[PDB]
Design an enzyme around this catalytic site. Structure first.
Site: not given
Ligand SMILES: O=C(CO)[C@@H](O)[C@H](O)[C@H](O)CO
Ligand SMILES: [Co+2]
Length: 290
Positions: A245, A151
Site C-alpha cells: 500500500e 483495519e
C-alpha cells in the site's frame, strides 16, 4: 505460502478509476493480487464488473477491495438514518463485489474514514453501533462468501481501534467467522510497542496485512523491521494475503485523504513506479524468507 498484492492507488490520484489496466499490470509484475477501491465498483456497470472478473480469471489474479466509508455512510453513527444509509451502501458494495468475483473487503467498513476531530464523538456509543452494524453486514456477506477485514488504524485517522489489542477485542466481541483483523505496517509503526509482537498477538485473527514504509514509500526505501515482520508471519504460520500500500503522489482525492503534502516519488514516471514496485517485491520476498 503467502500471496502478494498491491493497491491500485499507488498509481492514481482518485479512488474511482478503471481497474482493468491494473489487472494486466500486476500480472506483468508477478503479483498474485490487485486490491481495488470499493468506490470504483459500487456504481460500475454490470458489463464492466463481468469484464473485470473475466480479466482477473484470464490472468489468474485475485481481486480484493478496500473501503473507507464516508461520513454520510458511518455505520458507527448514533444517527439511525446515517447508520442505515451506511449499511445499505455496504450491501450495494458487496453486491458489486459478487459480480466482480471479489471475496475480501477491508479498511474502515465499521465506521467512517478519515475521521474529522473538529466535532465531538462518543467512543463507547460508536463502538456499540459499529459492532451491531458489522454483525448485520457479516450475515449479509455469507451469501457471497465475503470476508470483512477490520483495519487497525493510527489515532489521527480513527478513534475506535488504534492497536492490535483493541482490534482483537473488537473482532472477538463481533464473534463472526467471516470478520477478521487487518494489520498495516504504517498504522502499527505509530501505535504498537513492537510491530512483530502485534502480528504475533493478532495470530489466528489476522486476515490480511498491508505493507509500506513508515512514510508509505515502497518497502526497502525506509527503516521498517522487514526481517522481524517476516519472522512474526512465520511464527503465526501466516499463508494469507500481503498487500503493498505505497502512497508517494501528492494531489487528488487520494493525496488529500492520505494527507500527503509533498512529492515522495522524485516525480517518478509510471514506468519508474513499476520498476520500484518490482524491486520492492523482490526485497520483501527475500526479507520474508520466500
Ligand atoms: O491504511 C489505510 C488508510 O490509512 C488504507 O488501507 C485504507 O484504510 C484503505 O485503502 C481503505 O480506505
Ligand atoms: Co491499510
Amino acid at each position: 505460502s503467502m500471496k502478494y498484492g498491491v493497491y491500485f492507488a499507488y498509481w492514481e490520484d482518485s479512488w474511482d478509476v478503471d481497474f482493468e489496466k491494473y489487472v494486466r499490470k500486476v500480472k506483468k509484475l508477478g503479483l498474485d493480487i490487485l486490491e481495488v477501491a470499493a468506490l470504483g465498483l459500487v456504481n460500475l456497470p454490470e458489463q464492466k464488473l463481468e469484464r473485470l472478473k473475466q480479466l482477473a480469471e484470464q490472468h489468474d489474479i485475485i481481486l480484493t477491495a478496500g473501503i473507507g466509508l464516508p461520513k454520510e455512510y458511518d455505520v458507527s453513527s448514533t444517527d439511525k438514518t446515517v447508520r442505515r444509509n451506511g449499511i445499505t451502501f455496504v450491501k450495494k458494495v458487496m453486491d458489486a463485489m459478487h459480480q466482480a468475483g471479489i471475496h475480501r473487503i477491508g479498511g474502515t467498513v465499521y465506521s467512517y474514514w478519515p475521521v474529522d476531530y473538529s466535532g465531538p464523538f462518543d467512543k463507547p456509543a460508536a463502538r456499540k453501533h459499529s459492532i451491531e452494524s458489522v454483525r448485520e453486514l457479516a450475515e449479509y456477506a455469507r451469501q457471497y462468501n465475503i470476508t470483512l477485514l477490520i483495519e487497525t488504524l493510527n489515532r489521527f485517522e480513527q478513534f475506535l481501534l488504534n492497536d492490535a489489542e483493541e482490534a482483537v477485542a473488537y473482532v472477538k466481541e463481533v464473534n463472526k467467522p467471516n470478520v477478521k483483523v487487518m494489520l498495516d505496517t504504517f498504522h502499527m509503526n505509530i501505535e504498537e510497542d513492537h510491530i512483530a509482537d502485534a502480528i504475533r498477538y493478532t495470530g489466528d485473527h489476522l486476515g490480511q496485512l498491508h505493507i509500506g514504509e513508515a512514510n508509505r514509500k515502497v518497502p526497502g526505501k525506509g527503516s521498517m523491521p522487514w526481517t522481524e515482520i517476516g519472522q512474526a508471519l512465520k511464527d503465526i504460520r501466516y499463508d494469507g494475503y500481503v498487500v503493498m500500500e505505497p502512497f508517494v503522489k501528492t494531489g487528488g482525492q487520494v493525496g488529500r485523504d492520505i494527507k500527503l503534502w509533498r512529492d515522495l516519488s522524485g516525480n517518478a514516471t509510471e514506468e519508474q513506479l513499476d520498476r520500484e514496485l518490482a524491486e520492492s517485491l523482490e526485497f520483501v520476498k527475500a526479507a520474508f524468507g520466500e
